[PDB]
Amino acid sequence: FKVAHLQNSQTNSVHGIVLLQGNNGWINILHSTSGLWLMGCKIEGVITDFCIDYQPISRGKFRTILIAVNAYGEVWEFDLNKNGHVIRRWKDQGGVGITKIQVGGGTTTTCPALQISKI
Amino acid sequence: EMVIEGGKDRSIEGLCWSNVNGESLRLFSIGGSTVVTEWDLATGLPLRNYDCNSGVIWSISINDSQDKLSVGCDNGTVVLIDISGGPGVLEHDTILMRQEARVLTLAWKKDDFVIGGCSDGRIRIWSAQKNDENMGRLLHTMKVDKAKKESTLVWSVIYLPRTDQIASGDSTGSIKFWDFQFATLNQSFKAHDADVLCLTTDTDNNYVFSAGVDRKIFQFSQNTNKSQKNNRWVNSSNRLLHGNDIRAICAYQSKGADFLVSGGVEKTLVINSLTSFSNGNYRKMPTVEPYSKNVLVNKEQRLVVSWSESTVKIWTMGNYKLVCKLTLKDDQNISTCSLSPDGQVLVVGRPSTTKVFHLQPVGNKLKVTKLDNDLLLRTSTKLVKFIDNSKIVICSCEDDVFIVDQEVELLEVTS
Amino acid sequence: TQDSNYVRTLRQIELKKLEKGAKQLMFKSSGNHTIFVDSREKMNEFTPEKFFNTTSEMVNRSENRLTK
Amino acid sequence: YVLTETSAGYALLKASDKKIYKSSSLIQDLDSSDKVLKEFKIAAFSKFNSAANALEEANSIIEGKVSSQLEKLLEEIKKDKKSTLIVSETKLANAINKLGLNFNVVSDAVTLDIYRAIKEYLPELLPGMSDNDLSKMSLGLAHSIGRHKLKF
Amino acid sequence: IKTKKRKTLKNLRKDSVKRGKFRVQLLSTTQDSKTLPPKKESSIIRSKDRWLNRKALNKG
Amino acid sequence: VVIEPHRHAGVYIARGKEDLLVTKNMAPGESVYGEKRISVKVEYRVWNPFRSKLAAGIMGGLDELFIAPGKKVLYLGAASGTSVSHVSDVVGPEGVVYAVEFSHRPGRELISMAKKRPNIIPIIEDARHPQKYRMLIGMVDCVFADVAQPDQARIIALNSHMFLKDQGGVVISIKANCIDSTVDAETVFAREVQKLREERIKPLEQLTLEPYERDHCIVVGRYMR
Amino acid sequence: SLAKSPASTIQILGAEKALFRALKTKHDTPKYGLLYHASLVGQATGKNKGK
Amino acid sequence: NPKAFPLADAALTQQILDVVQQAANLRQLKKGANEATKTLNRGISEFIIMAADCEPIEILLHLPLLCEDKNVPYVFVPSRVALGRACGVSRPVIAASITTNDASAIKTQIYAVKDKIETLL
Amino acid sequence: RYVSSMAIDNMGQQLAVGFASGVISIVSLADLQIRLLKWHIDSVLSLSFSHDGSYLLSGGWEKV
Secondary structure: OEEEEEEOOOOOOEEEEEEEEOOOOEEEEEEOOOOOEEEEEEOOOOOOEEEEEEEEEEOOEEEEEEEEEOOOOEEEEEEOOOOOEEEEEEEOOOOOOOOOOOOOOOOOOOOOOOOHHHO | OOOOOOOOOOOOOEEEEEOOOOOOOEEEEEOOOOEEEEEEOOOOEEEEEEEOOOOOEEEEEEOOOOOEEEEEEOOOOEEEEEOOOOOOOOEEEEEOOOOOOOEEEEEEOOOOEEEEEEOOOEEEEEEOOOOOOOOOOEEEEEEOOOOOOOOOOEEEEEEEOOOOEEEEEEOOOEEEEEEOOOOEEEEEEEOOOOOOOEEEEOOOOOEEEEEOOOOEEEEEEOOOHHHHHHOOOEEEEEEEOOOOOOOEEEEEEEOOEEEEEEEOOOOOEEEEEOOOOOOOOEEEOOOOOOOOOOEEEEOHHHEEEEEEOOEEEEEEEOOEEEEEEEOOOOOOOOOOEEEOOOOOEEEEEOOOOEEEEEEEEOOOOEEEEEOOOHHHHHOOOOEEOOOOOOOEEEEOOOOOEEEEOOOOOOOOOOO | OHHHHHHHHHHHHHHHHHHHHHOOOOOOOOOOEEEEEOOOHHHHOOOOOOOOOOOOOOOOOOOOOOOO | OEEEEEEOOOOEEEEEEOOOHHHHOOOOOOOOOOOHHHHHHEEEEEEEOOOOOHHHHHHHHHHHHOOOOOHHHHHHHHHOOOOOOEEEOOOOOOHHHHOOOOOEEOOOOOHHHHHHHHHHOHHHHOOOOOHHHHHHHHHHHHHHHHHHHOOO | OOOOHHHHHHHHHOOOEEEOOEEEEEOOOHHHHHHOOOOOOHHHHHHHHHHHOOOOOOOO | OEEEEOOOOOEEEEEOOOOEEEEOOOOOOOOOOOOOEEEOOOEEEEOOOOOOOHHHHHHHOOOOOOOOOOOOEEEOOOOOHHHHHHHHHHHHHHOOEEEEOOOOOOHHHHHHHHHHOOOEEEEOOOOOOHHHHOOOOOOEEEEEEOOOOOOHHHHHHHHHHHHEEEEEEEEEEEEOOOOOOOOOHHHHHHHHHHHHHOOOEEEEEEEOOOOOOOOEEEEEEEEOO | OOOOOOHHHHHOOOOHHHHHHHHHOOOOOOOOHHHHHOHHHHHOOOOOOOO | OOOOOOEOOHHHHHHHHHHHHHHHHOOOEEEOHHHHHHHHHHOOEEEEEEEOOOOOHHHOOOHHHHHOOOOOOEEEEOOHHHHHHHHOOOOOOOEEEEEOOOOOOOHHHHHHHHHHHHHOO | OOEEEEEEOOOOOEEEEEEOOOEEEEEEOOOOEEEEEEOOOOOEEEEEEOOOOOOEEEEEOOOO
């Protein structure tokens, strides 16, 4: 699992999501306080790892992107501040057994932002 | 209007229409075999048996603009058949890039792409766009959520043109909607309890109807403006109307007609409304409406003849007693039949030949003997109706009206 | 590695001797020969020397039958 | 009352029919020729017969492998213009020179039978040539077009 | 005659008998080949209906 | 050392130290592909039932092989001279073989052996468009098919309806995998002989050539009309 | 026929009798062959002309 | 590249490169075009994998010409970099031959992948 | 046709009508299209939405 932040995008209300990597291609995203299943994102292949990217939009609004990798090397990016819909699908140049993706240089799940304007 | 009968050990699994604007209707159909069969609607015979050049056909679909024909075969092939050569003439075009498992259902996106659900639980996407670099090779593969304790088969695949999705029903009962570009799932519903054999949609793709062996018809709706701007189907409704199964479903929607038609293992047809499915009413047709009869009686001897597929049977009133039957197996298909007044000679007749049998009541049984006439043995018969005890009138399947035991002048009709 | 080279070239010698020895032999054919005929009496009869023309010498081995 | 366009190289041949155009494009089952029926039905009307020149041979070869509106077909349209007569084309994909200007063309399902007849008996009566000469000019054209397409 | 009627029926109906190394097949008729589409492959039809009547869906 | 003749002249059996099948020469002096050459004053090229496909049908026994020394034959599938060399040997210098292929990678050696033999004329166009070589030759006496494409019956039906005279021969070699794998050779060969007698090809014989090729057949037929 | 041969064959291509005697008894094979007279191998000196 | 016949799609290329990785662990592949042609000459190759990614593809398309003589299956995958990763070396690999064995642990996987290859020939 | 419960969400887009027969029906208030939810085998006694409106709590005569 990985824990991340999500914005409601009709209120400016954030809440934590946990993201579980499942069997088929599935990522099950669910609320970190109530445990309610919010959405799910399925990639095509053997899901091996995933990471969370954030991008700011305006004052006090950001957008959460799930970045999930096949074993083969093809990467899906899901916008999940709306319904968990794909916005980009690209392919890793080379790479055949893919174990771990990570982002960095901004707020990851391991360098987390304490304040929403610091995302 | 008409009925086109097939004979012993013949079935029909898929059939598609083709009407290029300005030309006649054309009706192709697969059976459980290696050929496609195109029928001319006049005679009620096959006018073409095109043997597709790879394996046993499992599904058939027609291109949008209807110049090409996909047949999806048991050895994993998808074969394109060039249809636009005129009614009757069918050419082989291209075998698409092969695979292992049999492709059980087909659909086209447009003239461009062809989607196919296979028996390994996957959904392939090939490009049938001629004069591209990737023509014929399979562009994408998607895998549905497999059953835990048995193999999964994707049974039904349609393309939804208003959005850009593929709807797919498989043998777990789950119905999935896939974004075509990015080739990936948007949302999965766990709708039925067993397989989803057939699913269809309306014109503007505000509804998707679906049905299978658990005999309920589910309706998935996207009619709200928020549903259309969010691309979110909801599992709207669910009806239980059929008795055993639903193996075929289709929809028609026009200015004075909006109905979905469904039928299955129980032999009856069911009509529902498209935009008023859950609310409105429905009509379960009778299992047979005998526009072409299979039973007639003769008042002398109080007897009645009745023919099912390739056998006739005769019984008398008294109670009742089965006096004779003719399971003629030199025959393969039956059609209409008539007895002589006085009950002497029976004549059975199909669109390929006809045959006449003298009958003699020998008591609690009959004796039946063929009487040879090669004109009858060569002629095609639709109707035989017995002018006299000897004279009959014959309507041929190629619009001939003979009088035997010779030719009625018949004027022509404005086309 | 050099005794592996020795065994490999011995194997290649026997490989080439095998292929260009079997190229100059002739093997007896074993194929399901099938003949298509008319209505039923042509099938009921013996196929009467339609390509054997002797039922003793030139019938049952097919590498070269003959027509005298 | 009809012509038919038959080729053997750069040498094209607009051979006319010994019957009507409807009789040519309607029955076609009466030839069955040994030699005499094709010899009677045949009529060598026009023979735009070029030579072993590689330019003219490969030019008509490219126009035969593509649509057939070559200069020899324009010569046939010149040398058959009587009353916008009926023509029998070989390939249906030569529709441009089939119906371009004053020629009622027909090539469907019995034109192939009459082309079987006239192609069976091209050398016996149409030219003043012999069988080895026709095979030699055919193989010269064949080697020319082969080395043209297959580069060297 | 009760225990061999299907035997003499099939042995008079069927064709393509053996002749030593050979096998003399009958060619079929344009009559049947132009009046009807060919028969279904009972292997695949049995596969599809046996699937739809598998034991895992409790029919009744 | 003793050459006996076959049922078709131009085909012989060189008996002796190796009782093996053989044809004549129309190439004076030389082999083309390293096939063995037997002289008996007169030069002879060994045919191989494994290297070639028609030789396997001859070795399995083809009685009315319509390839015969007084004809001209159309070969739709050689790709190289390894069979049409022997067909030009058996048809002799009286006739002509039209070796028509599509893939121009071994068409180089096809044209290279057609340089040496005037019997062999090549066509480098695909055999589903015979109209593109309308203007080259017509009215052959026997077609041969060795195409491993799925539309074998349609390709040779088009070539025989355009270029085969009546009552002539059709020899078609059918690979089972190029049509339908996973189902046996008996059903796919029955399906193809029915598909070919849908056209005006009366089937005469099929044989399976089993010691030379896996799951192949050679079907001969006479072109009706 | 030269193009469908591996690069090791193109190395030893001239020296067949030395090669096959040094294989049929277990000795060391040559390293130059017909390619020894190339100008680059002329520029090299030592064991790196084998290289 | 147009002249790289049969090219694999994503699922087939994923299982091809999976069997390449386990053959590399079992020391059952010859990586490189010259070693692939040597196994083609000696007849000890199960199937050939090539890369449709080399900037002269004519340094490859000669081993097809002796694959079709020994009727050994051959296939193209789109990335020489990924083929080198699968073969388990640090360089890009242009071609790789999975060698023959009869006591091999991955014999069933090799046979399944080579049947999926010879379906598309 | 007797209705024993109703609920609205925080936007007024959808509305839950729980009937005494046991069914629930979410109407979409902008266009009055309904969706039926049938689980309660006796009367529906209580309905609520979540804050985002994507979950519906229901309770009835079964103690579930």
